[PDB]
C-alpha cells in the first residue's frame, strides 16, 4: 500500500559542474521508472540550481537539515519557510552525522520535526543505534526512544505523510554488516511501535533503510514488507549505481 | 588609505521574490555610487540566485557562516569551497548570534577563519563583548582575546586582506546605545592591538562597525577615522535605507 521512496544524500559533495553532470545523468538513467519515488538532497547552495537542472524530470528535491526559526535575527540558520520557498520537499533530520558531529538532541530533532510539519514539508527522520547500544542489545530501547521524542509530544498524527530512516550506525564503518532479516526486523519494530498508538498512521509511514545499499543487496532489501525504500549515501553520487538502487525498489515493492 | 565596505547581513530573511525585488532595488539605488564597496549576504540557498541578480552591478556577494569541512560525509555542513564555487566572497564568521545561539567558540572561529584563507575568501571576523563583560569594563580584554585566537596562532598576515567587525553586544536589546565616540575607541584599540604585531597590516584592515546602524546613524559613524564601514542588519532589508548608509560611507571617506 506504500509507494517506495529512494532518497540520495549527497552530503558535503557538490559543485555546479557536478550539479550538472549528475542531474543530467540521473535523468537519463532514470528514464522509464515510474514505480519509485526519487528525491535528492544536495548542499543548500545547490538546491536551486539542482531544481533547474532537474526540471522536466520526476526527480524531487530535498535538504540535509533545518534550524528552528522561520525568519528573524538568526545569522546562518536554515529556515523551513525558505526551504518551502526554494521548492525542497524532503528534509533530512537527525542524520546520524549531526547527532554526532553536531550533538543534535532528540528534543532538538523533535522540534525540527514539528516545524517542518507546520510548513507542510516532509520530514525524513533519521534514527538508529551506536556500535555499543547494538552490542548491548539496545536497538529497540534506542529506536523507540528516538521516536517517542515526536510521538510523545506531538502525537501519532505527526507521522502523517512522514518518513522514517533507519541508520544502523553500528554497521556503518565498522566492518560490520546488516542482513536483510536484520533490518526488516527493526523495521517491523518501528512500525509496530507506532501501531501500538495509531495503527492506521503506522500503515502509511515510509520506513526507509538507511544502511548501506548496493546492487548485490538492493533487491534482497526491498523484498522486506516493512522496508519502503532507502536513504542512500555515497552511491547517490554515481548516477548508474543510484539508478539501480532505484529500479530494485520499483521492481521490488 | 581605506576604501569603505558596507556589508548587509540579511540574516534569517529572504525568498525568490524578495531576492528579486531587493536586488533590483539595490541595483538602482547604488547605480551611481563610486567610492564604497558593497556586499550582501543572503540565506545560503539564495546566494546563487542573488549572484545572478547582481550580474552587471558592483554588488558583491556574501555568506552568513561556513563550517570546517571542504567535502565528505557531513550531512548539513557548508563548505568554503562550495561557497567559492557559487560566487560568495565575504563570509561572516563569529557573529554574536552564533557564539551565543550555536555556542560557537574562539577556537572554532579561528579555525573557520583559517579555512577561508586557504581558499581565497575574505573572512568577516565578528567580535564584541557582552553586557556582562562591558559592564565589567572587560572590553579590550575580550576583544583582544577574540582577535588573538587568529593572531596568536596564524599571524598578522592572517589579517592581510581581511575584515573585522566589532559588535557592541552589550548594546543589543539591552537598552544601551554606543556613541560614535565610544565605538571609535574600540575600533582603534583593535587597530593598535594588531599594530603591535605589524602596523602595516594594521592600517590595511577593514574594521566595520557592527552595532546598530541605520539611515540616520551612518554619517555620525563614518566620521570616526577608525570605522571603515558597516555590517548592517535590519537596514539591509530596505534598499533606500541601505543605500543611504552606503552613500554616507562614500561621502565620509571621500577626502
CB B38 within 8 A of CB B69: no
Contacts of B132 (CB under 8 A, 6+ apart): B170
Contacts of A111 (CB under 8 A, 6+ apart): A68
Cell of A245: 538502487
**What distance in Å separates residue A159's CA from the closest CA in chain B?**
23
DSSP single-letter state for residue A57:
S
Give the three-state DSSP class for A41: strand
Rounded CA gap, B176 and A192, in Å?
A: 56
Between the CA atoms of A91, A96, A99 and A105, what dihedral angle is there, to the nearest 10 degrees? 70
Rounded CA gap, B137 and B151, in Å?
A: 22
Asked if residue B233 belongs to a known ligand binding site, the reply is yes
Q: In the Cβ-directed half-sphere of A16, how many Cα atoms lie within 13 Å?
A: 9
Contacts of A200 (CB under 8 A, 6+ apart): none
- HEC string of A93-138 equals ECCHHHHHHCCCCHHHHHHHHHHHHHHCCEEEEEECCCHHHHHCCC
Give the three-state DSSP class for A69: coil
- Yes or no, beta carbons of B74 and A47 under 8 Å apart: no
Residue to substitute from A15, A17, A75, A125, interface B, most B β-carbons within 10 A: A75
DSSP single-letter state for residue A63:
E
- Yes or no, beta carbons of A12 and B86 under 8 Å apart: no
Q: Sort strands A90-93 and A5-9 into parallel, antiparallel or unpaired.
A: unpaired
Give the three-state DSSP class for A228: coil
Cell of A141: 530501547
CB A140 within 8 A of CB A23: no
Measured distance between the N- and C-terminal CA atoms of chain A, rounded to whole angstroms: 9
Buried b / exposed e over A126-151, threshold 16 CB at 10 Å, is: bbbbbeebbeeeebbebbbebbebbb
User: What is Dmax (Cα atoms) for chain B?
Assistant: 51
Cell of B104: 560557537
Contacts of B44 (CB under 8 A, 6+ apart): A44, A45, A76, A78, B63, B64, B78
**Phi, psi at residue A230, to the nearest 5°?**
-145, 140
- HEC string of chain B equals CCCCEEEEECCECCCHHHHHHHHHHHHHHCCCCCCCEEEEECCCCCHHHHHHHHCCCCEEEEECCCCCCCCECCCCCCCHHHHHHHCCCEEEECCHHHHHHCCCCHHHHHHHHHHHHHHCCEEEEEECCCHHHHHCCCHHHHHHHHHHHHHHHHCHHHHCCCEEEECCHHHCCCCCCCCHHHHHHHHHHHHHHHHHHHHHHHHHCEEEECCCCCCCCHHHHHHCCCCCEEEECHHHHCHHHHHHHHHHHHHHHCC
Closest by Cα among B38, B209, B212, B76 to A77: B76
Rounded CA gap, A43 and A10, in Å?
A: 7
**What distance in Å separates residue B44's CA from the closest CA in chain A?**
6
| Catalytic residue list contains B250 | no
- Cβ-based interface (< 8 Å): residues of B facing A: 9, 11-16, 43-49, 64-65, 69-79, 82-83, 85-86, 92, 95, 97-98, 101-102, 233
Rounded CA gap, A69 and A83, in Å?
A: 12
Closest by Cα among A158, A79, A92, A156 to A124: A92
Residue spans of the domains in chain B: they are 1-255
Rounded CA gap, A145 and B161, in Å?
A: 50
What residue of A is the nearest CA neighbor of B126? A75
Q: In the Cβ-directed half-sphere of B131, how many Cα atoms lie within 13 Å?
A: 8
CB B31 within 8 A of CB B63: no
| Catalytic residue list contains A17 | no
Resolution (A): 2.6
How was this model experimentally determined? X-ray
Give one word for A240, left, alpha or beta, with left for phi > 0 and alpha for psi -120 to 50. alpha
Rounded CA gap, B140 and B236, in Å?
A: 29
CB B163 within 8 A of CB B90: yes
- How large is the C-alpha radius of gyration of chain A? 17
Superfamily of domain A1-253 in CATH is Aldolase class I (3.20.20.70)
- Cβ-based interface (< 8 Å): residues of A facing B: 9, 11-16, 43-49, 64-65, 69-79, 81-83, 85-86, 92, 95, 97-98, 101-102, 233-234
Rounded CA gap, A89 and A229, in Å?
A: 17
DSSP single-letter state for residue A213:
-
- Yes or no, beta carbons of A75 and B82 under 8 Å apart: no
Closest by Cα among B245, B255, B251, B243 to B57: B243
How many angstroms separate the Cα of A14 from the Cα of each of A18, A245, B73, B82? 6, 21, 12, 7
Residue length, chain A? 253
**Residue A61, strand partner residues:** A40
Buried b / exposed e over B183-216, threshold 16 CB at 10 Å, is: bbbbbbbbbebbbebbeebbebbbbbbbbbbbee
CB A160 within 8 A of CB A201: yes
Rounded CA gap, B62 and B95, in Å?
A: 14
Class of CATH domain B1-255: alpha beta
DSSP for A126-188, please give it.
EE---HHHHHTT-HHHHHHHHHHHHHHHH-GGGGTT-EEEE--TTTTTTT----HHHHHHHHH
How many angstroms separate the Cα of A176 from the Cα of each of A58, A171, A179, A223? 35, 4, 10, 21
User: What is Dmax (Cα atoms) for chain A?
Assistant: 49
Vertex A58, ends A53 and A63: CA angle to 5°?
A: 65
Amino acid at each position: 500500500m506504500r509507494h517506495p521512496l529512494v532518497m540520495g544524500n549527497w552530503k558535503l559533495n557538490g559543485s555546479r559542474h557536478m550539479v550538472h553532470e549528475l542531474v543530467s545523468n540521473l535523468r537519463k538513467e532514470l528514464a522509464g521508472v515510474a514505480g519509485c519515488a526519487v528525491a535528492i538532497a544536495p548542499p543548500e547552495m545547490y538546491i536551486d540550481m539542482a531544481k533547474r537542472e532537474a526540471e522536466g524530470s520526476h526527480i524531487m528535491l530535498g535538504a540535509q537539515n533545518v534550524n528552528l526559526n522561520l525568519s528573524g535575527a538568526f545569522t546562518g540558520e536554515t529556515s523551513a519557510a525558505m526551504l518551502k520557498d526554494i521548492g525542497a520537499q524532503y528534509i533530512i533530520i537527525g542524520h546520524s552525522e549531526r547527532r554526532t558531529y553536531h550533538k543534535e538532541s532528540d528534543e532538538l530533532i523533535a522540534k525540527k520535526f514539528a516545524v517542518l510539519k507546520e510548513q507542510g514539508l516532509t520530514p525524513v527522520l533519521c534514527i538508529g543505534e551506536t556500535e555499543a547500544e547494538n552490542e548491548a542489545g539496545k536497538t529497540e530501547e534506542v529506536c523507540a526512544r528516538q521516536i517517542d521524542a515526536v510521538l510523545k509530544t506531538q502525537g501519532a498524527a505527526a507521522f502523517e505523510g512522514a518518513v522514517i530512516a533507519y541508520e544502523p550506525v553500528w554497521a556503518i564503518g565498522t566492518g560490520k554488516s546488516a542482513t536483510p532479516a536484520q533490518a526488516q526486523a527493526v523495521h517491523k519494530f518501528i512500525r509496530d511501535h507506532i501501531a501500538k498508538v495509531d495503527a492506521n498512521i503506522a500503515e502509511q509511514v515510509i520506513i526507509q533503510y538507511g544502511g548501506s545499499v548496493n546492487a548485490s543487496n538492493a533487491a534482497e532489501l526491498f523484498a522486506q514488507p516493512d522496508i519502503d525504500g532507502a536513504l542512500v549515501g555515497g552511491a547517490s553520487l554515481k548516477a548508474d549505481a543510484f539508478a539501480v538502487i532505484v529500479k530494485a525498489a520499483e521492481a521490488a515493492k
